Design a protein around this ligand. Structure first.
Ligand code: PIY
Ligand code: PIY
Ligand code: PIY
Lengths: 291, 291, 291, 291, 291, 291
């Protein structure tokens, strides 16, 4: 990167200015998962980018999942799964493992990576200071809503206390578990939780890291890939798309309809994808606006 | 408790006044472990008592261990131990399990129990916001200091940030793990960590829950049990006492010599032992002062 | 109180927890008069209990009367009274004596008693910083409203400035005198003033110390004594009750209808009655709620 | 005052500017007594002048005595005096009367007069919030120090809390009584108390209202009257002067030696003497500086 | 001024009290121009009077013009004028000169004069921190609205930021130039700008220094001079008055109709006219109220 | 700049991270002059870069000169110069022109350019709020110190008030004129003033824009150009260098010896030179450190 002239280095930095002004002093919620968390180089770049935002006076909030790591831990403990549809039932035993893995392993890695740059990261669940609650959720198998145990959706969010946390200079790293109204802790889909937190905090942007170039309207036609779409056109395309793209689109719909100015599905396989998406126009990924 | 006259109920409450004045607005660090954490009734009373302190304008800070639960989890994962002396070596693999169990299971139980009374508890490690660091520690087997892996002592404590946390009304629940100066996370003895935190925060008292009536100078002579002792007399008795009483005495010595006005070894098998020790004169347990 | 087991001492303290949470950070207005102010032991217990509340982060506000002491001082000065009905006319001369006795003697005793526990008590009248005003009040003798001089009801209260005072850690001790809109100072019934202050400050509770076990619906039938009553049922019983119980009931009605969640008529002859009423279920006295 | 040209009105106001700059944001302690408090016109002008200072962003603090009113009240109550030298012994009974008269009558008049201009005045004793303490003082009769009861000198002053009070916009009106270290309330000479408060608060000026034109070095030679004197020359003149001028000079000496930049003995018989002394060069009275 | 008795000096100062209370903590906007800025003695008195207000806790805001100095500078630079009606066209070149003269010379004199009394004055334009904007304005020559270049009216005012500035103890000295919505800086009539700033800041008074005794309803009849007039009667008199009195009346109308309690046209040829108008009843000049 | 791959765009932004952390929350003083202020594209890039710093939570402070523009204005006004050595004497007349040009024209351009990005820029001189003073300075012609009029060096700086200004989000644009201790305004060399302000404010960096690639030790040998030098080696080279490079080196010496961690002489002819110098390693220009 040294054989590149200094006056092009300048222009690249200068073209970040409009996006620095747009985001200065604002909340950005970043759903972190997939490859951007398994490969060590992408991991470290992601942590650097959270430090970047913080050292620009931007307020990042990280929401993470960890489905596969839960599965691996359950197999290691020899805990036999019950499955309704393609859903593991979340017994009290499974919840304990999920919470232990998400908060006690997956979140800790990200906190330590970010904290390599300063005392920024703080790990939290809805349990801590009652920062958010859950409501138990059923799923539809074939065409019947069924109980798959202690799994929920985000209910209420302590918006004031969360924004106190970021105004102090902290980067919350959220593991998505929270008590219901009776104190019973549920596991929440990280994609959904990210949308709910962005709406509650009044985020300026929601970023969704996934392992795709962007949204394809007619996958796999290479030139069905769009770079911007309104929630109006996006919702009528939802019943079309691949199984795994559904939760990331529903999150973008709910956030942007909820008042978040834009949500973005970006390529987690790209190093520093957050920097590219936020401070560059030539980014991959697709932006969702209301319409 | 209803067949007891109301005018004796009054006197019991009135006699708490001097101790309410002594502790109002002050930090109290409470090492929580042993039976007071395995039995469900003592557990819930302990959480109620932390809520009690908080609703008196007192600032409790909870430090917890969980040695046996780590051991159980390692056996379940089939992770074979290496032992030098009677010490398990803490490999990177063992540290991950310890951190996951301490922060992701043991601490979560206490956070949820306390939070049954309000949005008070917040779970933290030295990793979070770089609140404290560790320095790797060796142990003496027979008469040689030996490496038992990623185990340490508390190094530095971010006193300002910790006191910000409690002045906001939060009750930190601390899992004793922290990075060394290179970012490598170590496991810290909870008894020692409690003493270090009490000294760094300028605590008014350190409470050490154990499964004993109190300190016996000549165990097991029943009337060698003392209720107050100076650090001068206590340190010369240290090489006498039982193996498990050593870490709780060393903590009291280091805290009280470090400027903490008094440290207390109290009976964790007694329901509401914290309330009895703090707001009553007829408590069991032994108070350590400087001398 | 030492021959009583420690585990019952614990339960008594633990059962205060719900009431500590209910009152933490809240205003409590306490009308102090009768025997709880003439006997030296009850006096000192009352002052201790105000210190108790303050060292729990509760915000007590004390309103006091002193009818008999005014009368004694007037007789000592040989000031001849004029009486309409059973009411002394409050001439400018009588007002001066009342103000001097209430603010310069009765209030000072309570300020010094409370201040034996710390720098808490501050003596105030509506005159000070214009904290509240009075409106001149007439009384009905037989069936004609008559002028009995410089006696009034509380008019407006400087709510903001009063709450500044308590948030600073002060326990106001209020002598009930205040200027009217023309600067002319009136004497206000302490029972009525206590109700008005509780409503203006948004108090969580109003406590009325009197020399009775509680409200008897059919005095003197021993088992007409109630421990809770709605303002609806209480107001229709008002024209029944004894002369001296009237002002304490009217105060409770006006406070609780005014939005104060509960008012309490409690037994001032009981040592630490405030502690018993607030932090115990087995208290005497009767609670007034809206209904 | 209307037949005087407007351009001389202007110059009088303009010449106040240097003294407005000197005093803006500063504490001024004013000892108020003598004729400036018995005549109703001088009274009301004094209260107006305290309002004046407050509406210039100056911080007045009023200290008052009331020797004669105590005497009158004692005669009315038929309380027989004991006299050592020319000093009444202050029994507990006499103290109660003094406190009641000073705080409950004399101070209230001044609070209401000042408060005619706004919510400024607040009445205080050392009893309130432990704002200052007393130490019991003996007096020398002929040549023996003798106990004249519950009379003292100011001991310690809660400087922080007093300055909080004035920064809130309040004008403290101080009645000079305060507890000793055992809680026993003493009466303090108002002249002495004024000097002690000025030194503790770091006052810019101490004003001493008396019924004299100023300090005469050789009374009654009319042209021995000085308008400025150093503490050096003033202390060697102290054993010369009239009995009643002694306490006002000792106060000025102790304040100015204590670091108060200047103390002033001014003519309380002059209407608006405070305004003339502070904002005019052609004032009567004598200024004391260190030297 | 020394041969005038001290007790009349007192009364002059005492009669300022009602006006000190009315203005304490309030904004006063002062349009400064005409003779009060060309003569050196009136200049220095005006600066002293701004210091006076500031050392009373009043918040002065100074708006200045400088028409003649612009003209002189343009002649010195040999810049030829274009005139439509009697209006110079404000080309970009003329604007640069106007801005340079107003902000770089006329304002600096006033800042340094005021600052002779302390660190009070700060020079500002609408350009600084975007404190206010302009909208380009046309003028009517004969009966056609015509473009006279870069001249405007005040558009929006950053009220919050302006009041931050004065609460910090600063006396803004405003040169009336401001950018339009496209960043193009316009020159604004100082009389009009003063009215707009007073309304935006919620000023208690607007003062307009002019070289007249006051408003004459039938100039030049000597006894058509009024000392108070309602906006109702004043607006119907506007089409009558002299050319140069028009802008000062329109400003008073717009301010007082805009909610400013009173606007005043006062005699700038009188030394300390501001002091006389604000703190005296025997001032010249005419007060405008709504009606 | 669009034909350049996105993954190199990323790396350029990512490599700014260490410098964002170094400067976040810190003061940077930027001396702005030469070509970076005459060409319109470099001008606008410089203003963008000040906005850049501000939208990263960095605190830029701009100091500007304008020697040539003063000269041009003096010629236009036909003001004849007196010259001692090669120095124009600064008569009161010349000072007025200099102040008018620097504050009323040169500074206004920069304020409006910066403010195109937001309400950031505020123009100030040492005159405003007494933010800094000057001391009159003589110069050595041949070998005699001579009076060249109202030219000075920065004397004292109101550090507290200046940092209040930047913490509010303002970017001061400083025109270097200030009063001496007698209120007489002097013109200060902008290079020297920049060094003094950086030292007084505790700046993290001083940037000196000049029209050179960097410091040549043996000009004009092309490979005598250094990119870093200690103050020790730099001071012994000072008597060697070109006339115009002297003031920029003396400033760097005085700032860096004064405790400013590094001063930089950078190429003002390079677009976005500030961005390149601060957030890139491949910048031109030379860094001065202490040694
Ligand atoms: C440091 C600072 C804040 C926190 C925290 N966690 C939840 C709420 N606050 C944890 C550590
Ligand atoms: C100490 C602190 C506050 C007060 C007070 N009294 C009325 C308002 N504020 C009096 C003493
Ligand atoms: C000192 C303090 C404040 C200012 C200022 N000017 C515009 C906004 N703030 C200028 C100097």
């Amino acid at each position: 990167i040294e054989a590149l002239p200094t006056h092009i280095k300048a222009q690249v930095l200068a073209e970040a200015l409009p996006w620095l002004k747009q985001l200065h002093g604002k909340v950005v919620v970043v759903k972190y998962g997939g490859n951007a968390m398994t490969d060590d180089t992408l991991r470290r770049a992601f942590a650097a980018d959270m430090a970047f935002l913080r050292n620009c006076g931007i307020h990042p909030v990280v929401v993470h999942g960890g489905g596969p790591q839960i599965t691996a831990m359950l197999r290691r403990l020899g805990i036999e799964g019950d499955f309704k549809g393609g859903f593991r039932v979340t017994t009290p035993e499974v919840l304990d493992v999920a919470r232990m893995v998400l908060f006690g392993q997956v979140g800790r890695e990200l906190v330590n990576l970010i904290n390599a740059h300063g005392p920024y990261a703080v790990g939290i669940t809805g349990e801590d200071a009652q920062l958010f609650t859950a409501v138990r959720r059923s799923v539809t198998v074939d065409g019947v809503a069924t109980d798959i145990g202690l799994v929920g959706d985000v209910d209420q969010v302590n918006t004031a206390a969360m924004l106190d946390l970021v105004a102090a200079g902290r980067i919350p790293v959220v593991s998505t578990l929270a008590p219901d109204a009776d104190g019973v802790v549920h596991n929440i889909n990280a994609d959904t939780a990210a949308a709910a937190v962005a709406e509650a905090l009044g985020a300026e942007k929601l970023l969704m890291l996934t392992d795709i170039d962007g949204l394809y309207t007619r996958w796999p036609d290479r030139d069905s890939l769009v770079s911007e779409i309104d929630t109006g056109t996006l919702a009528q395309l939802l019943p079309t798309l691949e199984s795994g793209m559904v939760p990331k689109v529903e999150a973008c719909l709910r956030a942007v309809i909820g008042g978040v100015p834009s949500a973005h599905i970006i390529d987690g396989r790209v190093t520093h994808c957050v920097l590219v998406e936020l401070f560059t126009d030539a980014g991959t990924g697709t932006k969702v606006v209301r319409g």
